[PDB]
């Protein structure tokens, strides 16, 4: 269950800006952070974890200052490094607490889709394929030791402390099981004597699922799974397919294995 703090900073020009954040614990979104709000919105009844209201106000202040500072920094770097707008900046920081002592952390920042730099040990280190101006910005960024120190204890101390808290308060919600409903259909036939068999599976929590076409006990090699697409409710949807000749359609079935299915897999024949 890793914590991923996502940041999306849009800079249309020298005036217009919009930096929005959001946080995920595992597959569930725990926090929301809109450019309009001065507060970090908690989406789950346990999003504050074990942190007291005072601790939570202190962290809230850090992000408030971070947001303001980061924006004036990108703007100052645009002028200094002579970079043209629009600019798209994303920051992906966080950690994962391992059972039952260790915990690794990360802080990656990307520019115009591709990675540019990340915090490594005590300082900002650039990616190998980063543009030569990133090296020039690291020179400025690393000079400020106060931020290099503030990021360092927040990732090594506060992130794991927070994760441990969220895991304790949200345990039940993170361990919840929602049974999926599955049904079959006839896909668009790409051949005159060929039919694409389709297996629909939706409403399953958590995300990990195994949906594969079967003859009997024997697996189907040509099983083409889809993307595990999300629902409005924190559930998911999958659509596994298999292209076979009209005569081979008889006897074929599709097995579905899910943590909610208490051993009893959904076996739907054609």
């Amino acid at each position, epitope marked *: 269950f890793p914590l991923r703090c996502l940041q999306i900073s849009s800079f249309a020009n020298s005036s217009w800006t919009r930096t929005d954040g959001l946080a995920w614990l595992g597959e569930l979104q725990t926090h929301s952070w809109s450019n309009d709000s001065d507060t970090v919105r908690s989406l789950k009844p346990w999003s504050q974890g074990t942190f*007291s209201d*005072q*601790q939570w*106000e*202190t962290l809230q202040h850090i992000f408030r200052v971070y947001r303001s500072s980061f924006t004036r920094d990108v703007k100052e770097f645009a002028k200094m490094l002579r970079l043209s707008y629009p600019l798209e900046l994303q920051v992906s920081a966080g950690c994962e607490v391992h059972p039952g002592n260790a915990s690794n952390n990360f802080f990656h920042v990307a520019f115009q889709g591709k990675d540019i730099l990340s915090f490594q040990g005590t300082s900002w280190e650039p990616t190998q394929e980063a543009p030569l101006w990133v090296n020039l910005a690291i020179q400025v960024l690393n000079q400020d*030791k*106060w931020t290099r*120190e503030t990021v360092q*204890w927040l990732l090594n*101390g506060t992130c794991p402390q927070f994760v441990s808290g969220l895991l304790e308060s949200g345990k039940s919600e993170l361990k919840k099981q929602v049974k999926p409903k599955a049904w079959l259909s006839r896909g668009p036939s790409p051949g005159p004597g060929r039919l694409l068999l389709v297996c629909h599976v939706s409403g399953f929590y958590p995300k990990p699922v195994w949906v594969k076409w079967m003859r009997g006990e024997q697996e189907q090699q040509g099983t083409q799974p889809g993307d595990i697409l999300p629902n409005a409710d924190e559930t998911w949807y999958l659509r596994a397919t298999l292209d076979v000749v009209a005569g081979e359609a008889a006897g074929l079935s599709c097995r579905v294995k899910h943590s909610s299915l208490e051993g009893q897999d959904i076996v739907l024949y054609w």
Partner: T-cell receptor
Amino acid sequence: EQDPGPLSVPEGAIVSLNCTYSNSAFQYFMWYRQYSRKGPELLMYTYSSGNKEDGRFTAQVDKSSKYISLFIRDSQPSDSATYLCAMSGDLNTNAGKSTFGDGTTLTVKP
Amino acid sequence: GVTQTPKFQVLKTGQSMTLQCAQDMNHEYMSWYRQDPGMGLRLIHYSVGAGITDQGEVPNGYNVSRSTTEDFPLRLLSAAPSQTSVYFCASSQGPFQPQHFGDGTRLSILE
């Protein structure tokens, strides 16, 4: 996280005033001076492990040994005052806000 | 800097007293400390921003308000000889940055 009682040092001698914060995880460390009938006045502020010079004042920090210190080289009788230390950064001690030590009174004989 | 009002005050027991505090530095955080021989600096109340106040170490007998982000007045409802002290106002940019202290206020509560 505190410091001890009274000290009397003669003129032009190196004064060692220290604070210990075991067991807490502070990140930013302050030093203050307070004269009789006056308010506290910030001497030095340091966030990184090691020493920082500012005239006759050296502020040494050890995040590993969890102890900080202030050294006054060739101390003048002007320095006779109370020396208060405060520490921040520990999200578990006063949710990050600074924690003040009791204070050390110093008298520099002319 | 920080300028607290008044510098000195002599009052009788069970009498209301609001000692004012100003800050022009545009600091978010503001605090009230009291200093007695032995115990040193004890936090009474603190404000992290406008319209937000919380208890300190010794918050009993005192009231605080943060209507604006410049003024943080300390109020004593029924002043007692237990509150005969030296009061300090302190403002800070953030919870980790160093504080800027006022010149202090001496309070004399007489029966």
